[PDB]
Write an enzyme that holds these catalytic residues in place. Structure first.
Site, mmCIF file in Angstrom:
data_model
loop_
_atom_site.group_PDB
_atom_site.id
_atom_site.type_symbol
_atom_site.label_atom_id
_atom_site.label_comp_id
_atom_site.label_asym_id
_atom_site.label_seq_id
_atom_site.Cartn_x
_atom_site.Cartn_y
_atom_site.Cartn_z
ATOM 1 N N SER A 131 0.767 -1.352 0.026
ATOM 2 C CA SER A 131 -0.140 0.107 -0.071
ATOM 3 C C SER A 131 0.731 1.445 -0.096
ATOM 4 O O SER A 131 0.427 2.425 -0.024
ATOM 5 C CB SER A 131 -0.926 0.168 1.187
ATOM 6 O OG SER A 131 -1.919 -0.925 1.328
HETATM 7 C C1 LIG Z 1 -2.147 -2.818 1.067
HETATM 8 O O1 LIG Z 1 -1.466 -3.104 0.084
HETATM 9 C C2 LIG Z 1 -3.179 -3.510 1.880
HETATM 10 N N1 LIG Z 1 -2.614 -4.732 1.686
HETATM 11 C C3 LIG Z 1 -3.524 -5.874 1.884
HETATM 12 O O2 LIG Z 1 -5.053 -5.505 1.777
HETATM 13 C C4 LIG Z 1 -3.358 -7.195 1.601
HETATM 14 N N2 LIG Z 1 -3.526 -7.688 0.291
HETATM 15 O O3 LIG Z 1 -3.971 -6.601 -0.447
HETATM 16 C C5 LIG Z 1 -4.144 -6.701 -1.895
HETATM 17 C C6 LIG Z 1 -4.040 -8.063 2.548
HETATM 18 C C7 LIG Z 1 -3.696 -7.717 3.986
HETATM 19 S S1 LIG Z 1 -3.594 -8.962 5.017
HETATM 20 C C8 LIG Z 1 -3.906 -10.199 3.890
HETATM 21 N N3 LIG Z 1 -3.298 -11.282 3.986
HETATM 22 N N4 LIG Z 1 -3.683 -9.629 1.956
HETATM 23 C C9 LIG Z 1 -3.020 -3.166 3.291
HETATM 24 N N5 LIG Z 1 -2.526 -1.808 3.597
HETATM 25 C C10 LIG Z 1 -2.572 -1.509 5.043
HETATM 26 C C11 LIG Z 1 -1.316 -1.338 5.686
HETATM 27 O O4 LIG Z 1 -1.079 -0.870 6.815
HETATM 28 O O5 LIG Z 1 -0.492 -2.210 5.233
HETATM 29 C C12 LIG Z 1 -3.756 -1.900 5.901
HETATM 30 C C13 LIG Z 1 -5.054 -1.061 5.685
HETATM 31 C C14 LIG Z 1 -4.097 -3.428 5.713
HETATM 32 S S2 LIG Z 1 -4.292 -3.457 4.019
#
Ligand SMILES: *C(=O)[C@@H](NC(=O)/C(=N\OC)c1csc(N)n1)[C@H]1N=C(C(=O)O)C(=C)CS1
Ligand SMILES: *C(=O)[C@H](NC(=O)/C(=N\OC)c1csc(N)n1)[C@@H]1N=C(C(=O)O)C(=C)CS1
Lengths: 631, 631
Positions: free
Chosen positions: B347
């Protein structure tokens, strides 16, 4: 005959300075076929205001039609359905009698009224195949296709000097419409090699934003159009038209009293490529045949397929590829992945390892040792054409014929000063052997840039190799470090060249400017520079190619099914690599031809085939392409 | 410090030319602490062969041991087993009585015998080796990589200019031993940046084979020692010294009748790096404890952990990564990973994606449209992080606070022309929007090279984006296009610097070749050149800053580790997603220190955590280093 488009006018005091773009030089194939040329074009754009209506735009669009022709089929079904309701509101109302009534009930919002109005449309679509209608819709859709303050391209087509003279003012009269003359690359072979050619920055773009420092430090103005990807970028220095600059001194009144020429201008230099355009087109055709010359036997998650073809003696390049997103089988052009993307290639690196194993005195030329499953404290490398039993005396050629992992495993161990014995521990610091090994592979172009005359080359993924010896033996077998299809080509090529690694080039020669003459006298030959020679003896060298022959000219030689023999003898090597998409495989092929005085070489990469390899035949691509070239 | 050592002696009819070699420039930290020095060293070498009964070859090694002491690091287990066997044919044959018979019975052959012996010798008996044995052996192993007529290295021994003579004796009096004087590098911080510093070639190898043309094109002879890895290779022009070149005229009898000096030589120029080593040593220390602080919570093959710390004004103040195996303990140095390696990053890309929105007017500076678990087609396929909570109202600056990975998804579509409507089709051509987005990212460093002054910087794996808009949405959320840690750093730092991307550099200042040890007159200053501004505007960058400022100073990620501590730090977080074996996850961290007048920028990447839910305080390493720097 250098052309003249006014690019930049600055008033200082009584001085006014003017700069004109001039055509870039052309890009041509090794035989002189124009691949990239120039075109004088008018660009008509619309700039839609803040409060500009739909009745507003349809009107301009109408006057705009009686003035220029458009190409139809960007038009969508919805475009036509919307244009129809726009044109026939009386006719359209009658089909929605209940809904117009229940629009003021409040029973429905517009958002569901508009969707049933679209549902009842058919034979009335043809009520405007009145080609006059589709023309207006053609223009109109682009005027609605974009940002408010932003101008929007409606047509960018070839224009004459007198054409622009007659129409530009009378286009410009209409509200929102501006015109400009522009230089535009034209591409006779349409989509072919387009990725490799790269683009030049749009007139809107200055020098592209992220490329500022780059072009500003070499003297450009932020307004200058420049090459921004690949070939236009790479050879910007030669392709660019040195622009015309004029300084005018003026009266108070505006009258030009005197004028001086800072630069009269220079039409860019023409660049010839090593590419044989026809061969190119044929290879793309063969690659599209072969990709599902399986009808997806299983390979409907093969996601990339790569081919590089080259003259192994001067490094001339004749080569392209493309990927396959089979949530379909609908392919795109992955032209550049041939030297920009990194793949595990497996067993096709085996020639480099032996070379590594020769120059470090780890094995000898003709070395004959025996092979069979291997045993450590857990770790259990069986080679995969006998895993359980069947213990065979085998030399270095044969090891390449069979593509026998255990021979490479045994040389690797010997290179580590730790020859195999059953139940040995894996040597725990493999820093030193791994380094000797890598420098071996580096010599034939594996893990080092090939040096090709294009931007963005990668040398591959190169992770620490210190205390996971399993990764060490993976490396001796092509299952650790990722390589490039161009790297593979450079590698067979140096084998065919009796050990001379040569810097590949898609640049052939550089000529001087003309608007006519599809020659132009020579300025610069672009040579395939010798990079180094392998630290190995001719006999060591000859052995790898003797092995390479009998992997393609012998029987259980893992390249008989595709190369068995054909119109000219071809030596090579192949590769199947474990990787994880979910588990799948990589399939790799390298070779060259003809054996006695080579003239062609090639590398092939298919990524993520499902396949265990007593079923799949991709290097028929290699066979077919090699037949075409030599006949 | 000072001196010359003999390198080349050339005759041509009573006119000898003698070339002496000189010390390389030093490498120093920003305040002037010595990182890479020179020492004058004795290279002891063994070259015997053809009379190798090996029992005398051990005798030489025995003899040599009485003269030299040896670090025993390099002795392998196999080394020890072979040596133990030789030392105790007594003890070994007593373990082989069953196999003794079988050799004579005929049932077993000598190779099998030796193979079985090796398995029976355990480490307990290997401990029966004496400290003096392990000294003979350390020498011995070097002299048994010995090709018959080829010199191998035994010891590099810091002996003075004037005691080399006393000991130079050992020359054809112990047989194979040759001695010689060479300039070698010294490292007063041990292994602490060795990869980055790089290596210069052996006096044996001269120019390395792989590098031949690269250095021959520069006028080097093949016998020249050169910079071959990293900084040594990068600043070769500055770091190398000019040789001392003498010319004598002899007569027939060898008597010197005249002499002239052509160059007296001079030490190479001193290189001052931007790195602070106390700062560098701390991060490694901190980074160490911080991967142990995940030894507990499951990071089993988390196999990479990286950090890049810097700012606009001069330099890379800090750059360390390591890599791990199997939590088996083993860390191994991987500092080069920060700019050479390609990691899916998550992210943290959102800051730039939000600016690609502003540039193409897909969003406004403040924009509020809301988050749905949103779906399209197929019959199931949908979106982000909770399935029910139809959440509302978010600002864009609120979107980075939550790391709203759906505001991004909306933004993409709104940039591809067609904003979300529940039940919508995929666009089928996403070339144009993918291009604009990618452009946007290149602006802040994401997707081009940073421009760092080290070899082999990679720009990340960048696959075609045309017709799989499944991938195109991933790109909005950092899950299609891999970057480097350095790329993240230049990117975050572009934000800190109010939209001004700076070219990182690890070189601070080049100093004049001085003969006597204080760092000389300033020759060149290595600048942090502004590559470009984002064409994002004054207020539009400030939001991304506020967005950053508010996921560090409350919103809930970033609070869990950057819960305001020493620091007005602003920053952003990233959790990714990797199925390269089995569903692990990448955890990434960017941010910048004192928000008012920003002095420090950092980037972190943890790869293959097996642990999804947003709980791990891996960004503490981040918070830790700022406490140090701001005291
Ligand atoms: C950013 O890329 C977000 N990543 C995800 O949502 C993961 N895959 O995304 C396509 C997802 C989270 S856990 C699971 N195993 N896959 C995250 N960005 C922020 C952060 O601080 O990293 C959060 C909102 C969680 S989501
Ligand atoms: C080279 O690496 C080839 N090995 C393999 O292909 C197997 N993995 O090897 C590590 C592979 C077989 S299928 C399964 N998924 N793993 C050897 N070289 C050739 C070849 O053309 O690939 C074959 C003789 C197989 S073994």
């Amino acid at each position: 005959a250098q052309g003249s488009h006014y690019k930049q006018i600055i008033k200082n005091d009584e001085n006014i300075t003017v700069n004109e773009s001039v055509p870039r030089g052309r890009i041509l194939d090794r035989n002189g076929k124009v691949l990239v040329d120039n075109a004088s074009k008018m660009a008509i754009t619309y700039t839609r205001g803040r409060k500009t209506t739909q009745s507003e735009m349809l009107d301009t669009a109408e006057k705009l039609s009686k003035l220029i022709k458009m190409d139809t089929k960007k038009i969508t079904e919805r475009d036509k359905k919307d244009f129809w309701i726009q044109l026939h509101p009386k006719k359209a109302k009658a089909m929605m009698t209940k809904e117009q009534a229940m629009l003021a009930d409040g029973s429905i919002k517009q958002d569901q009224y508009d969707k049933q109005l679209l549902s009842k449309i058919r034979k009335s679509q043809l009520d405007e195949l009145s080609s006059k209608d589709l023309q207006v819709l053609a223009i109109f859709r682009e005027m609605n296709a974009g940002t408010v303050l932003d101008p929007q391209m409606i047509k960018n087509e070839d224009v004459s000097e007198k054409e622009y003279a007659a129409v530009s003012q009378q286009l410009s009269k209409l509200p929102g419409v501006n015109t400009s003359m522009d230089w535009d690359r034209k591409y006779p072979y349409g989509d072919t090699l387009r990725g490799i050619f790269g683009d030049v920055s749009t007139p809107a773009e200055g020098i592209p934003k992220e490329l500022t420092e780059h072009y500003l430090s070499k003297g450009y103005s932020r307004n200058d159009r420049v090459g921004k990807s690949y070939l236009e970028y790479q050879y910007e220095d030669v392709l660019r038209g040195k622009k015309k600059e004029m300084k005018y001194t003026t009266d108070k009144s505006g009258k030009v009293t005197s004028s001086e020429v800072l630069n009269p201008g220079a039409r860019g230099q023409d660049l010839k490529l090593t590419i044989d355009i026809d061969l190119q087109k044929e290879v793309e055709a063969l690659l599209d045949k072969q990709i599902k010359k399986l009808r997806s036997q299983g390979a409907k998650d093969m996601d990339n397929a790569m081919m590089v073809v080259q003259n192994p003696k001067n490094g001339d390049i004749l080569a392209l590829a493309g990927k396959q997103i089979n949530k379909s089988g609908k392919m795109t052009d992955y032209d550049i992945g041939t030297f920009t993307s990194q793949f595990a290639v497996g067993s096709s690196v085996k020639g480099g390892t032996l070379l590594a194993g020769y120059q470090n005195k780890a094995i000898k030329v003709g070395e004959t040792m025996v092979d069979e499953p291997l045993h450590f404290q857990g770790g259990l490398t069986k080679r995969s054409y006998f895993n359980k039993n069947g213990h065979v005396s085998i030399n270095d050629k044969q090891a390449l014929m069979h593509s026998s992992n255990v021979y490479m495993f045994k040389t690797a161990l010997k290179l580590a000063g730790d020859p195999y014995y059953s139940g040995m521990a894996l040597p725990s610091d493999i820093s030193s052997p791994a380094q000797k090994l890598r420098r071996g592979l580096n010599q034939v172009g594996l893990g080092v840039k090939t040096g090709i005359d294009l931007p963005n080359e990668t040398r591959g993924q190169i992770e620490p190799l210190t205390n996971n010896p399993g990764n060490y033996l993976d490396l001796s077998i092509g299952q650790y470090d990722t390589y490039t299809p161009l790297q593979l080509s450079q590698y067979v090529s140096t084998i065919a060249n009796d050990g001379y690694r040569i810097q590949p080039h898609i640049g052939l020669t550089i000529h001087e400017s003309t608007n006519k003459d599809e020659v132009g006298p020579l300025k610069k030959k672009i040579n395939g520079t010798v990079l180094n020679k392998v630290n190995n003896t001719e006999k060591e060298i000859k052995q790898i190619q003797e092995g390479f022959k009998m992997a393609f000219n012998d029987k259980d030689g893992t390249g008989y099914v595709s190369f068995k023999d054909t119109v000219v003898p071809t030596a090579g090597k192949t590769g199947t690599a474990e990787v994880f998409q979910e588990p799948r495989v990589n399939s790799t092929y390298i070779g060259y031809a003809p054996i006695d005085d080579p003239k062609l070489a090639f590398s092939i990469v298919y990524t993520n085939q499902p396949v265990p390899p007593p079923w799949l035949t991709g290097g028929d691509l290699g066979r077919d392409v090699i037949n075409y070239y030599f006949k």
